[PDB]
Amino acid sequence: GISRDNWHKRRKTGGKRKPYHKKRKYELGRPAANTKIGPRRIHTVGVRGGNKKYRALRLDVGNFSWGSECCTRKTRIIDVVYNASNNELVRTKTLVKNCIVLIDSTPYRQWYESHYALPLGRKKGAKLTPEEEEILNKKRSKKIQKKYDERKKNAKISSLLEEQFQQGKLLACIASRPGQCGRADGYVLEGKELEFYLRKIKARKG
Amino acid sequence: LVTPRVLQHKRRRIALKKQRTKKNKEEAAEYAKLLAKRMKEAKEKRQEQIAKRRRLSSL
Amino acid sequence: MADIQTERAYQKQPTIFQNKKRVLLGETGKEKLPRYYKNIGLGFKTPKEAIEGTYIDKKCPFTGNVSIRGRILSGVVTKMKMQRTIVIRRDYLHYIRKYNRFEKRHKNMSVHLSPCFRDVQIGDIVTVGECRPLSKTVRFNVLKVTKAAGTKKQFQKF
Amino acid sequence: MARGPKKHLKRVAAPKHWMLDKLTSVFAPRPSTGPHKLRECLPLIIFLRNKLKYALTGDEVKKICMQRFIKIDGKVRADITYPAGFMDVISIDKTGENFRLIYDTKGRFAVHRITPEEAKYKLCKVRKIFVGTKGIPHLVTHDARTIRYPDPLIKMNDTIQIDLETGKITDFIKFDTGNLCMVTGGANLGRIGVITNRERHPGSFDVVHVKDANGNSFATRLSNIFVIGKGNKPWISLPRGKGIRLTIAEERDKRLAAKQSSG
RNA sequence: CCCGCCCCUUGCCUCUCGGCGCCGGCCCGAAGCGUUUACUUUGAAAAAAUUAGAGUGUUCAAAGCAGGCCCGAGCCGCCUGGAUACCGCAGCUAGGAAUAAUGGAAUAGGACCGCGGUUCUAUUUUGUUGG
RNA sequence: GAAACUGCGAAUGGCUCAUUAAAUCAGUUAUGGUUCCUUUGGUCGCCUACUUGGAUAACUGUGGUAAUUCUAGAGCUAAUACAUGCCGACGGCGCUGACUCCCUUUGUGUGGGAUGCGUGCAUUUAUCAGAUCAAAACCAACCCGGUCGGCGGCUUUGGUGACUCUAGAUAACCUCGGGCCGAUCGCAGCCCUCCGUGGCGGCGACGACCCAUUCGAACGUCUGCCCUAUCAACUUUCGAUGGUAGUCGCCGUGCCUACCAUGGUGACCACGGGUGACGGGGAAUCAGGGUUCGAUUCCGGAGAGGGAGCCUGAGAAACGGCUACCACAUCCAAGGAAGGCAGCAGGCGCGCAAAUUACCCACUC
């Protein structure tokens, strides 16, 4: 119906070619996923040669990663901020490859606190002392220090990172096609990208 | 309804599975012998090359 | 180089990561970027200029994804007035067997040009090679540029 | 016509090395899918009534194959058509006969009878090396056998002897200059001669010179060469003719010399 | 009209890795190529039928791809064909160097381990790992 | 052993030449840009298991409609249909380290260690590895040839001309109703610290996941075209050419969308128009060079009254499948229903112009 033909469209000279063969099943469209954020709705689509293709509508979880220290945990996908293909897609909260979105930022802290033995940015130390100090202080004899010594000075954590934990959000990059895969996935922004997209955000809105 | 014939097909079903595992054992055994054999010839060749180099250096 | 972004998106090479390990350079140092390149094979050689320089382009074969496989051809420059591509020409001779004469015919083709080459001028010989499609009228990329023909680009004392 | 795959091949579309006539009807057998390619096959039924003449109609072959007197590559087959090709062994055990499929210097599959002892193995070219899962290698051959754990010096364009009984190759030949080769396709076909020289081009369609023991030099593409044994010493049995590739004048001279068309 | 010689002769080197030699030392095949093309010559690769054309007594022929042999059956068989040529172009391969285009140092750079001045970089070795 | 469910085929063939001028098609090349039923070869263990769950047909019986290969209601009963889900043999791996022992409090050098979680392949993402070049002089931690501060001796998959290849490691992701790892069927044998059980062996049949193969399919490269200028400028936000990102698709790609640039093509004939133009292998004539024809038995393509959409399947935008509009034409109790001979015969019409409503699966497939 809606098709992805190539026997339409002008040649280089501005010429036209007269109608040749009728539309066929291997040149075919099928309308866009237009996936949002919400409760999971998945549809299974039969596709050529078999080998079913998953189309995801309204995901709310993706597997992001923090490849700086190589941990990857499942985290909720809150809202869109920047979509580098169009401005309109952000307004209706459409989710596609290479967007910039927000997450809860929760397990990354839990991992950091247990492994590097330090909290991130904090409102107050009063919260920590009755519980959440129980993990941070430890009763080991022998391997209070012995393990943790090797973790020291490999946890400088950068300025633009640390400030974001306090808000409870982090900026990560969709590196999947949700409409073809059936899953959202990605990597979290680091380095110069994370400097770049801040400037685009503050430029465009506000 | 279970009959003796049924149980044969299930007994032969598992006999083949065990036979399969025993075969992947023996192949990897022979290949390891063969693989470890070559670790010898190659070494010898390397030694020879080294000797040649030394001779060349001589002058 | 220090600016290579003018898009609404960030530009970078695949197969590159930015580590956050160690901290001590003093003033400056590693630009926090190792360069990516690869061999092309077939007796063609990567330019020094590619490995030196900084550009992000995915359609050149010295950096980005695209192979050269199948045919290899030549041509000549005729025009450049487009960004990251050129136009070229192929002069050749068509024979007729009723007569015993030939006649001239030419076709024109576009082909993509790397930001690596920037010494191109209109009238240089160019070499190209078959590739997977990049665009509607681009199927090729440059492998090499040369000048070795009459009325050279600069005075003889080289 | 086409919307999916075809299931007919006519008489006149079919290759000429099956030596078909033109006064039986429009269709020809067409080999069904298998390890060999249809411009290199000899379909089974063409061996049984257009060569050896046991059968006379296709319905007879259907009554024969069902009885399970036929084998191919030491296993039992039971269909009108099977795509056996170069270097396979047919085995009828009732007659005590064994055949081999190999090329005349004319370039067509002949009758090359052999001892049953010879018919316990065949010679197979290697074409591709492919590392499988968990550090295990594979071979790929033209008869489409995947033989795991080969020796680690065997590479493509070599040939390997396979025991039909147990698989799992016992020995091999290594591709080297001066070894004896047979041709399997192209304009030169069925010629036997030593390698002599190689030629390489980065790219594709490398060629391979050849010379025989009649003092003639010729060349062919790389991928039409098959190795048969070391220099002037085949590791297989050879038919009459022996890759000489006589001119037409000399062939005339032989026939009028023996005066041979009667016994 | 295939080796060499006058200066040249398939122009050179540089060498280094895997063979041939001769008595550590020395010699010569393969590796980059001779500024680029047309042209010409050799290979490769080319569906069948048709066509040309070899063989074969279709009763001769148009055709066809067959068929021919010795024995009362007592051989339980023997022998043999189903060639070869052609296939505009364009593309692939190798040889030739006349002919027709194209090529270089004249506001100099070609040659030699000729030296200086200046800068960047390669990761090998002092058994290993770090400064 | 009728019938009926299930599996498979019906996308092959046959027919026509209407469309179609760089399109079709031919030679040549490319998948390192992809999909592939089937065959062939490999892949086959991290109060239920002596076998799980509940309905449909045929069948039995009662009906409706003018009419259809129309169809309702009631009573039964199956599975390689349908929906479920164990067991066996896990004595698997890394990182935590309750702890405990020796020598330097610690740190750090040590040996064992309970207790936790993950630990087949497939799927998606991030990260790491994917080694060897050419030599020395001292200092810091150190093996061996060996000694109570210092000398000599080593270093580790596969493949291509060329890949972000193949295989490996780490951290995770999991699709259920929507990955795999058999609750299936037929022939004929055995063995029991032993008496029909607990065990196991051969020969098949079917099904399923992945890899390879075969038959292809689909896009892409270079070159090749009849008449016409009383057709010379054409193409563009109704994307024309390119750049960047995304969507979609089996994949590559302005294929499509957003943003941005202003290009692309032509006297070497573009663009436009015409063709009683399907293309090629070929055919007729012919000294040499040519001219003319090719609907038509082989190969490729396109189409089934004209248009469009779609289901099923590995493969179809199918017409011996379906739905709608338009042009036709048929039946009707006027409520409705049914149709597409460019398949073989046959009829009407059209014309200068063209055969039997025959016999038969024996051959060839």
- Which method was used? cryo-EM
Structural contact between residues A38 and A60, judged by C-beta atoms closer than 8 angstroms: yes
Nearest Cα to C38, choosing from C74, C13, C10?
C13
* Residues 6 or more apart whose Cβ sits within 8 Å of residue D180: D192, D193, D194, D227, D228, D229, D230, D231, D232, D233, D234
Structural contact between residues A166 and A177, judged by C-beta atoms closer than 8 angstroms: no
Structural contact between residues D125 and D183, judged by C-beta atoms closer than 8 angstroms: no
| Residue A195 DSSP SS3 | helix
* Residues in chain C, overall count: 158
- Nucleotide whose C1' lies closest to the alpha carbon of residue D204: F161
Q: Which helix (H) or strand (E) holds A200?
A: helix A191-204
User: Phi, psi at residue D155, to the nearest 5°?
Assistant: -135, 170
* Residues 6 or more apart whose Cβ sits within 8 Å of residue D101: D42, D84, D85, D86, D87, D88, D90, D109, D112
Structural contact between residues D166 and D68, judged by C-beta atoms closer than 8 angstroms: no
Pairwise CB contact (< 8 Å): C21 & A154: yes
DSSP H helices, chain D, are 44-47, 58-65, 248-258
DSSP state, residue D146: -
B23 to A33, B5, B18, D137, D261: CA distances (angstroms): 49, 27, 9, 16, 58
Instruction: Report the half-sphere exposure of D89 (CA within 13 A, side-chain side).
Output: 26
User: Phi, psi at residue A73, to the nearest 5°?
Assistant: -135, 155
Q: Is D119 exposed, middle or buried (0-12, 13-18, 19+ CB in 10 A)?
A: buried
Structural contact between residues D156 and D139, judged by C-beta atoms closer than 8 angstroms: no
| Residue D167 DSSP SS3 | strand
| Residue C104 DSSP SS3 | strand
* Residues 6 or more apart whose Cβ sits within 8 Å of residue D241: D104, D105, D190
Ramachandran class of B48: left when φ > 0, alpha when ψ lies in -120 to 50, beta otherwise: alpha
Cis, bond preceding A142 (omega within 30 deg of 0): yes
DSSP strand pairing (A41-45 vs C72-79): unpaired
Secondary structure string (H, E, C) spanning A117-162: CCCCCCCCCCCCCCCCCCCCCCCCCCCCCCCHHHCCCCCCCCHHHH
Work out how many CB contacts closer than 8 A connect C with D. 4
Domain range annotation of chain C: 1-158
Pairwise CB contact (< 8 Å): C10 & A156: no
The answer to whether strand F lies under 7 Å from the CB of residue D23 is: no
CA distance D31 to C91: 48
Domain annotation for chain A: domains and CATH numbers:
1-30 (no CATH), 31-105+169-206 (no CATH), 106-168 (1.10.168.20)
Structural contact between residues A96 and A85, judged by C-beta atoms closer than 8 angstroms: yes
DSSP strand pairing (C72-79 vs A71-83): unpaired
Q: In a mutagenesis test of the B interface, which of D149, D154, D168 is the best target, namely the one with the most B β-carbons within 10 Å?
A: D149
Torsion (CA) A20, A21, A22, A27 in degrees, nearest 10: -110
CA distance C9 to D184: 57
Residue type, C124: D
Pairwise CB contact (< 8 Å): D152 & B27: no
CA distance A67 to chain C (A): 9
Closest-CA residue of chain C to D202: C42
Structural contact between residues D64 and D56, judged by C-beta atoms closer than 8 angstroms: no
Nearest Cα to C64, choosing from C31, C38, C34?
C38
Residue type, D154: I
Q: In a mutagenesis test of the C interface, which of A7, A193, A198, A204 is the best target, namely the one with the most C β-carbons within 10 Å?
A: A193
Output the furthest CA–CA distance in chain A (Å, rounded).
Answer: 85
Nearest Cα to A36, choosing from A103, A101, A107, A104?
A101
Considering only CB atoms, B38 lies closest to which of D148, D149, D152, namely D152
CB atoms within 10 A of CB B54: 9
Neighbours of chain A (3+ CB pairs under 8 A): C
- Per-residue burial over A159-180, b if 16 or more Cβ lie within 10 Å, else e, is eebeebbeeebbbbbbebbbbe
CA distance C12 to chain A (A): 9
Neighbours of chain D (3+ CB pairs under 8 A): B, C
Stated in angstroms to one decimal place, the resolution of this structure is: 3.0
CB atoms within 10 A of CB D122: 21
Q: Which helix (H) or strand (E) holds D182?
A: strand D180-183
